[PDB]
PDB file of all heavy atoms in Angstrom:
ATOM      1  N   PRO A   1      46.551 -23.230 -57.583  1.00 16.02           N
ATOM      2  CA  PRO A   1      46.558 -22.726 -58.964  1.00 16.02           C
ATOM      3  C   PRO A   1      45.240 -22.935 -59.630  1.00 16.02           C
ATOM      4  O   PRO A   1      44.863 -22.218 -60.555  1.00 16.02           O
ATOM      5  CB  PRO A   1      47.593 -23.616 -59.632  1.00 16.02           C
ATOM      6  CG  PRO A   1      48.417 -24.174 -58.615  1.00 16.02           C
ATOM      7  CD  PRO A   1      47.457 -24.425 -57.443  1.00 16.02           C
ATOM      8  N   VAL A   2      44.527 -23.922 -59.078  1.00 13.96           N
ATOM      9  CA  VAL A   2      43.187 -24.287 -59.693  1.00 13.96           C
ATOM     10  C   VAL A   2      42.234 -23.019 -59.838  1.00 13.96           C
ATOM     11  O   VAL A   2      42.146 -22.132 -59.003  1.00 13.96           O
ATOM     12  CB  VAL A   2      42.564 -25.482 -58.877  1.00 13.96           C
ATOM     13  CG1 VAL A   2      41.134 -25.804 -59.281  1.00 13.96           C
ATOM     14  CG2 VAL A   2      43.364 -26.725 -59.115  1.00 13.96           C
ATOM     15  N   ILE A   3      41.395 -23.020 -60.891  1.00 13.70           N
ATOM     16  CA  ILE A   3      40.597 -21.831 -60.961  1.00 13.70           C
ATOM     17  C   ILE A   3      39.157 -22.151 -61.015  1.00 13.70           C
ATOM     18  O   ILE A   3      38.564 -22.503 -62.013  1.00 13.70           O
ATOM     19  CB  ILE A   3      41.113 -20.991 -62.152  1.00 13.70           C
ATOM     20  CG1 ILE A   3      40.027 -19.986 -62.575  1.00 13.70           C
ATOM     21  CG2 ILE A   3      41.201 -21.841 -63.378  1.00 13.70           C
ATOM     22  CD1 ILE A   3      40.210 -19.428 -64.005  1.00 13.70           C
ATOM     23  N   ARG A   4      38.571 -21.973 -59.811  1.00 12.23           N
ATOM     24  CA  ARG A   4      37.129 -22.160 -59.577  1.00 12.23           C
ATOM     25  C   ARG A   4      36.653 -21.109 -58.578  1.00 12.23           C
ATOM     26  O   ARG A   4      37.518 -20.399 -57.934  1.00 12.23           O
ATOM     27  CB  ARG A   4      36.941 -23.535 -59.030  1.00 12.23           C
ATOM     28  CG  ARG A   4      38.219 -24.145 -58.451  1.00 12.23           C
ATOM     29  CD  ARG A   4      37.951 -25.731 -58.461  1.00 12.23           C
ATOM     30  NE  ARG A   4      36.568 -26.016 -58.347  1.00 12.23           N
ATOM     31  CZ  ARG A   4      36.045 -27.204 -57.933  1.00 12.23           C
ATOM     32  NH1 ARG A   4      36.851 -28.197 -57.545  1.00 12.23           N
ATOM     33  NH2 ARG A   4      34.706 -27.315 -57.896  1.00 12.23           N
ATOM     34  N   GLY A   5      35.308 -21.022 -58.372  1.00 12.61           N
ATOM     35  CA  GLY A   5      34.750 -20.099 -57.358  1.00 12.61           C
ATOM     36  C   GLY A   5      35.184 -18.689 -57.685  1.00 12.61           C
ATOM     37  O   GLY A   5      35.257 -18.321 -58.892  1.00 12.61           O
ATOM     38  N   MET A   6      35.562 -17.893 -56.680  1.00 12.30           N
ATOM     39  CA  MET A   6      35.962 -16.508 -56.866  1.00 12.30           C
ATOM     40  C   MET A   6      37.009 -16.270 -57.973  1.00 12.30           C
ATOM     41  O   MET A   6      36.990 -15.277 -58.706  1.00 12.30           O
ATOM     42  CB  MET A   6      36.446 -15.915 -55.559  1.00 12.30           C
ATOM     43  CG  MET A   6      35.490 -15.706 -54.479  1.00 12.30           C
ATOM     44  SD  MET A   6      36.595 -15.731 -52.863  1.00 12.30           S
ATOM     45  CE  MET A   6      37.423 -13.895 -53.185  1.00 12.30           C
ATOM     46  N   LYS A   7      38.037 -17.146 -58.038  1.00 16.10           N
ATOM     47  CA  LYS A   7      39.088 -16.998 -59.030  1.00 16.10           C
ATOM     48  C   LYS A   7      38.565 -17.070 -60.474  1.00 16.10           C
ATOM     49  O   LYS A   7      39.068 -16.354 -61.345  1.00 16.10           O
ATOM     50  CB  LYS A   7      40.183 -18.067 -58.865  1.00 16.10           C
ATOM     51  CG  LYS A   7      41.360 -17.771 -57.935  1.00 16.10           C
ATOM     52  CD  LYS A   7      42.532 -18.804 -58.333  1.00 16.10           C
ATOM     53  CE  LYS A   7      43.726 -18.239 -59.307  1.00 16.10           C
ATOM     54  NZ  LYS A   7      45.085 -18.940 -58.998  1.00 16.10           N
ATOM     55  N   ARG A   8      37.633 -17.931 -60.716  1.00 16.07           N
ATOM     56  CA  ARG A   8      37.078 -18.101 -62.025  1.00 16.07           C
ATOM     57  C   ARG A   8      36.259 -16.869 -62.395  1.00 16.07           C
ATOM     58  O   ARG A   8      36.231 -16.451 -63.531  1.00 16.07           O
ATOM     59  CB  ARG A   8      36.123 -19.306 -62.179  1.00 16.07           C
ATOM     60  CG  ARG A   8      35.039 -19.156 -63.316  1.00 16.07           C
ATOM     61  CD  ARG A   8      33.909 -20.148 -63.078  1.00 16.07           C
ATOM     62  NE  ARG A   8      32.597 -20.070 -63.760  1.00 16.07           N
ATOM     63  CZ  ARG A   8      32.381 -19.971 -65.104  1.00 16.07           C
ATOM     64  NH1 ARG A   8      33.431 -20.074 -65.983  1.00 16.07           N
ATOM     65  NH2 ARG A   8      31.171 -19.970 -65.598  1.00 16.07           N
ATOM     66  N   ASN A   9      35.635 -16.300 -61.369  1.00 15.37           N
ATOM     67  CA  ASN A   9      34.751 -15.119 -61.662  1.00 15.37           C
ATOM     68  C   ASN A   9      35.634 -13.928 -61.976  1.00 15.37           C
ATOM     69  O   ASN A   9      35.330 -13.234 -62.939  1.00 15.37           O
ATOM     70  CB  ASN A   9      33.921 -14.799 -60.441  1.00 15.37           C
ATOM     71  CG  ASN A   9      32.881 -15.904 -60.122  1.00 15.37           C
ATOM     72  OD1 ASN A   9      32.416 -16.573 -61.026  1.00 15.37           O
ATOM     73  ND2 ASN A   9      32.538 -16.068 -58.811  1.00 15.37           N
ATOM     74  N   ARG A  10      36.675 -13.755 -61.181  1.00 13.61           N
ATOM     75  CA  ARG A  10      37.557 -12.649 -61.368  1.00 13.61           C
ATOM     76  C   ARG A  10      38.371 -12.676 -62.665  1.00 13.61           C
ATOM     77  O   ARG A  10      38.514 -11.674 -63.315  1.00 13.61           O
ATOM     78  CB  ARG A  10      38.487 -12.636 -60.179  1.00 13.61           C
ATOM     79  CG  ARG A  10      37.879 -12.239 -58.914  1.00 13.61           C
ATOM     80  CD  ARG A  10      38.874 -12.671 -57.764  1.00 13.61           C
ATOM     81  NE  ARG A  10      38.230 -12.079 -56.557  1.00 13.61           N
ATOM     82  CZ  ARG A  10      38.933 -11.626 -55.517  1.00 13.61           C
ATOM     83  NH1 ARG A  10      40.189 -11.814 -55.446  1.00 13.61           N
ATOM     84  NH2 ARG A  10      38.227 -11.064 -54.522  1.00 13.61           N
ATOM     85  N   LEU A  11      38.889 -13.893 -62.962  1.00 14.70           N
ATOM     86  CA  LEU A  11      39.642 -14.045 -64.167  1.00 14.70           C
ATOM     87  C   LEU A  11      38.740 -14.056 -65.402  1.00 14.70           C
ATOM     88  O   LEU A  11      39.249 -13.679 -66.523  1.00 14.70           O
ATOM     89  CB  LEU A  11      40.509 -15.348 -64.063  1.00 14.70           C
ATOM     90  CG  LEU A  11      41.546 -15.311 -62.955  1.00 14.70           C
ATOM     91  CD1 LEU A  11      42.199 -16.622 -62.798  1.00 14.70           C
ATOM     92  CD2 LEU A  11      42.513 -14.265 -63.391  1.00 14.70           C
ATOM     93  N   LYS A  12      37.510 -14.545 -65.294  1.00 15.84           N
ATOM     94  CA  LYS A  12      36.615 -14.477 -66.465  1.00 15.84           C
ATOM     95  C   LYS A  12      36.404 -13.049 -66.693  1.00 15.84           C
ATOM     96  O   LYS A  12      36.450 -12.579 -67.802  1.00 15.84           O
ATOM     97  CB  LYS A  12      35.271 -15.132 -66.189  1.00 15.84           C
ATOM     98  CG  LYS A  12      34.400 -15.114 -67.482  1.00 15.84           C
ATOM     99  CD  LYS A  12      32.966 -15.716 -67.256  1.00 15.84           C
ATOM    100  CE  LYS A  12      32.126 -15.642 -68.498  1.00 15.84           C
ATOM    101  NZ  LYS A  12      30.616 -16.084 -68.241  1.00 15.84           N
ATOM    102  N   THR A  13      36.102 -12.342 -65.657  1.00 15.00           N
ATOM    103  CA  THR A  13      35.802 -10.926 -65.866  1.00 15.00           C
ATOM    104  C   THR A  13      36.939 -10.157 -66.547  1.00 15.00           C
ATOM    105  O   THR A  13      36.764  -9.373 -67.418  1.00 15.00           O
ATOM    106  CB  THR A  13      35.468 -10.235 -64.534  1.00 15.00           C
ATOM    107  OG1 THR A  13      34.335 -10.835 -63.917  1.00 15.00           O
ATOM    108  CG2 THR A  13      35.156  -8.802 -64.840  1.00 15.00           C
ATOM    109  N   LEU A  14      38.187 -10.439 -66.146  1.00 12.40           N
ATOM    110  CA  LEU A  14      39.349  -9.765 -66.723  1.00 12.40           C
ATOM    111  C   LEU A  14      39.590 -10.296 -68.119  1.00 12.40           C
ATOM    112  O   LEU A  14      39.723  -9.572 -69.119  1.00 12.40           O
ATOM    113  CB  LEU A  14      40.647 -10.058 -65.860  1.00 12.40           C
ATOM    114  CG  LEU A  14      40.764  -9.363 -64.490  1.00 12.40           C
ATOM    115  CD1 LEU A  14      41.758 -10.066 -63.579  1.00 12.40           C
ATOM    116  CD2 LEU A  14      41.107  -7.929 -64.704  1.00 12.40           C
ATOM    117  N   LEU A  15      39.627 -11.652 -68.225  1.00  9.31           N
ATOM    118  CA  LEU A  15      40.033 -12.193 -69.524  1.00  9.31           C
ATOM    119  C   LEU A  15      39.020 -11.996 -70.565  1.00  9.31           C
ATOM    120  O   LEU A  15      39.329 -11.593 -71.630  1.00  9.31           O
ATOM    121  CB  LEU A  15      40.417 -13.650 -69.451  1.00  9.31           C
ATOM    122  CG  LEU A  15      41.653 -13.843 -68.682  1.00  9.31           C
ATOM    123  CD1 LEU A  15      41.556 -15.145 -67.917  1.00  9.31           C
ATOM    124  CD2 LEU A  15      42.797 -13.927 -69.690  1.00  9.31           C
ATOM    125  N   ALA A  16      37.751 -12.196 -70.214  1.00  4.83           N
ATOM    126  CA  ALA A  16      36.739 -12.070 -71.315  1.00  4.83           C
ATOM    127  C   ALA A  16      36.567 -10.597 -71.766  1.00  4.83           C
ATOM    128  O   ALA A  16      36.050 -10.360 -72.870  1.00  4.83           O
ATOM    129  CB  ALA A  16      35.403 -12.633 -70.903  1.00  4.83           C
ATOM    130  N   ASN A  17      37.063  -9.636 -70.968  1.00  3.74           N
ATOM    131  CA  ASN A  17      36.900  -8.230 -71.366  1.00  3.74           C
ATOM    132  C   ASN A  17      38.249  -7.595 -71.767  1.00  3.74           C
ATOM    133  O   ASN A  17      38.362  -6.394 -71.936  1.00  3.74           O
ATOM    134  CB  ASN A  17      36.212  -7.412 -70.210  1.00  3.74           C
ATOM    135  CG  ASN A  17      34.856  -7.846 -69.947  1.00  3.74           C
ATOM    136  OD1 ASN A  17      34.032  -7.863 -70.969  1.00  3.74           O
ATOM    137  ND2 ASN A  17      34.486  -8.255 -68.737  1.00  3.74           N
ATOM    138  N   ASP A  18      39.293  -8.420 -71.877  1.00  2.98           N
ATOM    139  CA  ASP A  18      40.612  -8.049 -72.302  1.00  2.98           C
ATOM    140  C   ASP A  18      41.185  -6.981 -71.386  1.00  2.98           C
ATOM    141  O   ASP A  18      41.852  -6.025 -71.834  1.00  2.98           O
ATOM    142  CB  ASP A  18      40.649  -7.485 -73.685  1.00  2.98           C
ATOM    143  CG  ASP A  18      40.188  -8.519 -74.648  1.00  2.98           C
ATOM    144  OD1 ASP A  18      40.779  -9.622 -74.653  1.00  2.98           O
ATOM    145  OD2 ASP A  18      39.284  -8.179 -75.490  1.00  2.98           O
ATOM    146  N   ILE A  19      40.886  -7.032 -70.101  1.00  2.00           N
ATOM    147  CA  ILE A  19      41.356  -6.037 -69.212  1.00  2.00           C
ATOM    148  C   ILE A  19      42.726  -6.479 -68.572  1.00  2.00           C
ATOM    149  O   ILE A  19      42.748  -7.617 -68.073  1.00  2.00           O
ATOM    150  CB  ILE A  19      40.380  -5.825 -68.037  1.00  2.00           C
ATOM    151  CG1 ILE A  19      39.064  -5.202 -68.504  1.00  2.00           C
ATOM    152  CG2 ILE A  19      40.931  -4.937 -66.981  1.00  2.00           C
ATOM    153  CD1 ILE A  19      38.049  -5.002 -67.379  1.00  2.00           C
ATOM    154  N   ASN A  20      43.803  -5.714 -68.740  1.00  2.00           N
ATOM    155  CA  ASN A  20      45.112  -6.025 -68.052  1.00  2.00           C
ATOM    156  C   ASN A  20      45.087  -5.874 -66.518  1.00  2.00           C
ATOM    157  O   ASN A  20      44.615  -4.846 -65.982  1.00  2.00           O
ATOM    158  CB  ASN A  20      46.192  -5.040 -68.561  1.00  2.00           C
ATOM    159  CG  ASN A  20      46.398  -5.141 -70.036  1.00  2.00           C
ATOM    160  OD1 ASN A  20      47.272  -5.916 -70.479  1.00  2.00           O
ATOM    161  ND2 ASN A  20      45.601  -4.498 -70.806  1.00  2.00           N
ATOM    162  N   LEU A  21      45.466  -6.921 -65.739  1.00  2.04           N
ATOM    163  CA  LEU A  21      45.527  -6.621 -64.213  1.00  2.04           C
ATOM    164  C   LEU A  21      46.976  -6.538 -63.874  1.00  2.04           C
ATOM    165  O   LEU A  21      47.775  -7.423 -64.205  1.00  2.04           O
ATOM    166  CB  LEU A  21      44.984  -7.778 -63.407  1.00  2.04           C
ATOM    167  CG  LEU A  21      45.268  -7.627 -61.885  1.00  2.04           C
ATOM    168  CD1 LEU A  21      44.339  -6.583 -61.384  1.00  2.04           C
ATOM    169  CD2 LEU A  21      44.988  -8.878 -61.106  1.00  2.04           C
ATOM    170  N   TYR A  22      47.383  -5.404 -63.198  1.00  2.44           N
ATOM    171  CA  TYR A  22      48.779  -5.253 -62.748  1.00  2.44           C
ATOM    172  C   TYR A  22      48.533  -5.157 -61.252  1.00  2.44           C
ATOM    173  O   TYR A  22      47.454  -4.685 -60.811  1.00  2.44           O
ATOM    174  CB  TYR A  22      49.405  -3.945 -63.155  1.00  2.44           C
ATOM    175  CG  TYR A  22      49.515  -3.624 -64.664  1.00  2.44           C
ATOM    176  CD1 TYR A  22      48.390  -3.298 -65.369  1.00  2.44           C
ATOM    177  CD2 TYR A  22      50.720  -3.617 -65.340  1.00  2.44           C
ATOM    178  CE1 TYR A  22      48.472  -2.970 -66.736  1.00  2.44           C
ATOM    179  CE2 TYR A  22      50.811  -3.325 -66.703  1.00  2.44           C
ATOM    180  CZ  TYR A  22      49.725  -2.941 -67.384  1.00  2.44           C
ATOM    181  OH  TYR A  22      49.818  -2.564 -68.728  1.00  2.44           O
ATOM    182  N   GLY A  23      49.513  -5.602 -60.481  1.00  2.23           N
ATOM    183  CA  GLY A  23      49.529  -5.487 -59.002  1.00  2.23           C
ATOM    184  C   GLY A  23      51.026  -5.188 -58.592  1.00  2.23           C
ATOM    185  O   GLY A  23      51.946  -5.718 -59.210  1.00  2.23           O
ATOM    186  N   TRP A  24      51.259  -4.321 -57.551  1.00  2.00           N
ATOM    187  CA  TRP A  24      52.624  -4.173 -56.974  1.00  2.00           C
ATOM    188  C   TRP A  24      52.378  -4.247 -55.451  1.00  2.00           C
ATOM    189  O   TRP A  24      51.732  -3.413 -54.860  1.00  2.00           O
ATOM    190  CB  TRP A  24      53.202  -2.771 -57.315  1.00  2.00           C
ATOM    191  CG  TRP A  24      53.860  -2.754 -58.630  1.00  2.00           C
ATOM    192  CD1 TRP A  24      55.149  -3.081 -58.888  1.00  2.00           C
ATOM    193  CD2 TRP A  24      53.271  -2.534 -59.905  1.00  2.00           C
ATOM    194  NE1 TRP A  24      55.368  -3.129 -60.226  1.00  2.00           N
ATOM    195  CE2 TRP A  24      54.239  -2.778 -60.881  1.00  2.00           C
ATOM    196  CE3 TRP A  24      51.950  -2.107 -60.323  1.00  2.00           C
ATOM    197  CZ2 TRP A  24      54.019  -2.658 -62.240  1.00  2.00           C
ATOM    198  CZ3 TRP A  24      51.705  -1.973 -61.695  1.00  2.00           C
ATOM    199  CH2 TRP A  24      52.710  -2.219 -62.593  1.00  2.00           C
ATOM    200  N   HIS A  25      53.016  -5.277 -54.821  1.00  2.00           N
ATOM    201  CA  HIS A  25      52.871  -5.515 -53.441  1.00  2.00           C
ATOM    202  C   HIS A  25      54.013  -4.789 -52.652  1.00  2.00           C
ATOM    203  O   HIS A  25      53.976  -3.546 -52.558  1.00  2.00           O
ATOM    204  CB  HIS A  25      52.828  -7.042 -53.112  1.00  2.00           C
ATOM    205  CG  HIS A  25      52.498  -7.431 -51.729  1.00  2.00           C
ATOM    206  ND1 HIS A  25      53.318  -8.266 -50.969  1.00  2.00           N
ATOM    207  CD2 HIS A  25      51.494  -7.031 -50.891  1.00  2.00           C
ATOM    208  CE1 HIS A  25      52.824  -8.351 -49.729  1.00  2.00           C
ATOM    209  NE2 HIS A  25      51.732  -7.585 -49.683  1.00  2.00           N
ATOM    210  N   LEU A  26      55.064  -5.439 -52.141  1.00  2.00           N
ATOM    211  CA  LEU A  26      56.030  -4.716 -51.321  1.00  2.00           C
ATOM    212  C   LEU A  26      56.582  -3.396 -51.922  1.00  2.00           C
ATOM    213  O   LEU A  26      56.697  -2.361 -51.198  1.00  2.00           O
ATOM    214  CB  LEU A  26      57.137  -5.630 -50.822  1.00  2.00           C
ATOM    215  CG  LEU A  26      56.479  -6.815 -50.013  1.00  2.00           C
ATOM    216  CD1 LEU A  26      57.595  -7.760 -49.463  1.00  2.00           C
ATOM    217  CD2 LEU A  26      55.743  -6.269 -48.786  1.00  2.00           C
ATOM    218  N   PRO A  27      56.854  -3.407 -53.241  1.00  2.00           N
ATOM    219  CA  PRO A  27      57.378  -2.134 -53.746  1.00  2.00           C
ATOM    220  C   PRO A  27      56.414  -0.990 -53.441  1.00  2.00           C
ATOM    221  O   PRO A  27      56.881   0.154 -53.221  1.00  2.00           O
ATOM    222  CB  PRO A  27      57.599  -2.432 -55.262  1.00  2.00           C
ATOM    223  CG  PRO A  27      57.909  -3.944 -55.287  1.00  2.00           C
ATOM    224  CD  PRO A  27      56.855  -4.430 -54.300  1.00  2.00           C
ATOM    225  N   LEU A  28      55.121  -1.221 -53.489  1.00  2.00           N
ATOM    226  CA  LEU A  28      54.185  -0.132 -53.244  1.00  2.00           C
ATOM    227  C   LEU A  28      54.044   0.171 -51.790  1.00  2.00           C
ATOM    228  O   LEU A  28      53.405   1.127 -51.388  1.00  2.00           O
ATOM    229  CB  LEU A  28      52.817  -0.461 -53.944  1.00  2.00           C
ATOM    230  CG  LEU A  28      51.897   0.759 -54.140  1.00  2.00           C
ATOM    231  CD1 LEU A  28      52.562   1.868 -54.892  1.00  2.00           C
ATOM    232  CD2 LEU A  28      50.757   0.224 -55.059  1.00  2.00           C
ATOM    233  N   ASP A  29      54.595  -0.664 -50.901  1.00  2.00           N
ATOM    234  CA  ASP A  29      54.617  -0.356 -49.462  1.00  2.00           C
ATOM    235  C   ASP A  29      55.863   0.483 -49.150  1.00  2.00           C
ATOM    236  O   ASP A  29      55.763   1.559 -48.562  1.00  2.00           O
ATOM    237  CB  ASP A  29      54.699  -1.589 -48.547  1.00  2.00           C
ATOM    238  CG  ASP A  29      53.343  -2.297 -48.464  1.00  2.00           C
ATOM    239  OD1 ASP A  29      52.338  -1.563 -48.299  1.00  2.00           O
ATOM    240  OD2 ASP A  29      53.259  -3.549 -48.681  1.00  2.00           O
ATOM    241  N   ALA A  30      57.015   0.008 -49.633  1.00  2.00           N
ATOM    242  CA  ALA A  30      58.299   0.699 -49.441  1.00  2.00           C
ATOM    243  C   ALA A  30      58.678   1.958 -50.145  1.00  2.00           C
ATOM    244  O   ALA A  30      59.350   2.790 -49.538  1.00  2.00           O
ATOM    245  CB  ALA A  30      59.442  -0.356 -49.584  1.00  2.00           C
ATOM    246  N   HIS A  31      58.296   2.183 -51.383  1.00  2.00           N
ATOM    247  CA  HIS A  31      58.704   3.483 -51.991  1.00  2.00           C
ATOM    248  C   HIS A  31      58.774   4.766 -51.105  1.00  2.00           C
ATOM    249  O   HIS A  31      57.688   5.185 -50.638  1.00  2.00           O
ATOM    250  CB  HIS A  31      57.934   3.715 -53.320  1.00  2.00           C
ATOM    251  CG  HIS A  31      58.630   4.665 -54.247  1.00  2.00           C
ATOM    252  ND1 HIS A  31      58.237   5.969 -54.438  1.00  2.00           N
ATOM    253  CD2 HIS A  31      59.767   4.469 -54.935  1.00  2.00           C
ATOM    254  CE1 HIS A  31      59.097   6.579 -55.122  1.00  2.00           C
ATOM    255  NE2 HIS A  31      60.065   5.731 -55.530  1.00  2.00           N
ATOM    256  N   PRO A  32      59.894   5.418 -50.947  1.00  2.00           N
ATOM    257  CA  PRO A  32      59.874   6.627 -50.097  1.00  2.00           C
ATOM    258  C   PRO A  32      58.901   7.792 -50.426  1.00  2.00           C
ATOM    259  O   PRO A  32      58.618   8.695 -49.663  1.00  2.00           O
ATOM    260  CB  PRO A  32      61.340   7.088 -50.100  1.00  2.00           C
ATOM    261  CG  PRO A  32      62.120   5.842 -50.658  1.00  2.00           C
ATOM    262  CD  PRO A  32      61.155   5.317 -51.679  1.00  2.00           C
ATOM    263  N   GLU A  33      58.465   7.800 -51.710  1.00  2.00           N
ATOM    264  CA  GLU A  33      57.691   8.922 -52.120  1.00  2.00           C
ATOM    265  C   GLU A  33      56.199   8.554 -52.224  1.00  2.00           C
ATOM    266  O   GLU A  33      55.310   9.179 -51.661  1.00  2.00           O
ATOM    267  CB  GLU A  33      58.168   9.407 -53.473  1.00  2.00           C
ATOM    268  CG  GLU A  33      57.136  10.301 -54.152  1.00  2.00           C
ATOM    269  CD  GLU A  33      57.491  10.609 -55.630  1.00  2.00           C
ATOM    270  OE1 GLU A  33      58.626  10.252 -56.127  1.00  2.00           O
ATOM    271  OE2 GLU A  33      56.631  11.302 -56.284  1.00  2.00           O
ATOM    272  N   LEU A  34      55.997   7.421 -52.953  1.00  2.00           N
ATOM    273  CA  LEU A  34      54.651   6.867 -53.318  1.00  2.00           C
ATOM    274  C   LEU A  34      54.132   5.809 -52.392  1.00  2.00           C
ATOM    275  O   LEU A  34      52.906   5.498 -52.361  1.00  2.00           O
ATOM    276  CB  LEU A  34      54.791   6.312 -54.758  1.00  2.00           C
ATOM    277  CG  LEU A  34      54.509   7.177 -56.068  1.00  2.00           C
ATOM    278  CD1 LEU A  34      54.486   8.635 -55.816  1.00  2.00           C
ATOM    279  CD2 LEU A  34      55.455   6.717 -57.143  1.00  2.00           C
ATOM    280  N   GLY A  35      55.020   5.183 -51.663  1.00  2.00           N
ATOM    281  CA  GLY A  35      54.612   4.067 -50.794  1.00  2.00           C
ATOM    282  C   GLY A  35      53.537   4.232 -49.768  1.00  2.00           C
ATOM    283  O   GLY A  35      53.389   5.333 -49.260  1.00  2.00           O
ATOM    284  N   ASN A  36      52.874   3.100 -49.331  1.00  2.00           N
ATOM    285  CA  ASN A  36      51.813   3.110 -48.379  1.00  2.00           C
ATOM    286  C   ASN A  36      52.471   3.710 -47.077  1.00  2.00           C
ATOM    287  O   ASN A  36      51.842   4.499 -46.426  1.00  2.00           O
ATOM    288  CB  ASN A  36      51.242   1.687 -48.016  1.00  2.00           C
ATOM    289  CG  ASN A  36      50.477   1.086 -49.180  1.00  2.00           C
ATOM    290  OD1 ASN A  36      49.616   1.686 -49.848  1.00  2.00           O
ATOM    291  ND2 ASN A  36      50.681  -0.245 -49.361  1.00  2.00           N
ATOM    292  N   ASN A  37      53.648   3.200 -46.701  1.00  2.00           N
ATOM    293  CA  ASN A  37      54.311   3.679 -45.530  1.00  2.00           C
ATOM    294  C   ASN A  37      54.509   5.237 -45.532  1.00  2.00           C
ATOM    295  O   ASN A  37      54.250   5.909 -44.487  1.00  2.00           O
ATOM    296  CB  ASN A  37      55.675   2.995 -45.366  1.00  2.00           C
ATOM    297  CG  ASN A  37      55.512   1.612 -44.698  1.00  2.00           C
ATOM    298  OD1 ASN A  37      54.497   1.400 -44.002  1.00  2.00           O
ATOM    299  ND2 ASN A  37      56.490   0.698 -44.867  1.00  2.00           N
ATOM    300  N   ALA A  38      55.026   5.789 -46.601  1.00  2.00           N
ATOM    301  CA  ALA A  38      55.317   7.245 -46.555  1.00  2.00           C
ATOM    302  C   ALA A  38      54.130   8.097 -46.631  1.00  2.00           C
ATOM    303  O   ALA A  38      54.211   9.186 -46.057  1.00  2.00           O
ATOM    304  CB  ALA A  38      56.270   7.595 -47.762  1.00  2.00           C
TER     305      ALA A  38
END
């Protein structure tokens, strides 16, 4: 959970610029229409 090195750089970049980060892992693999698999 600690935030140093790459994590601090990435999160500073998002937080200091008020950028929302969203991520979808398995659901974005499995969806029959939009998924990586299909």
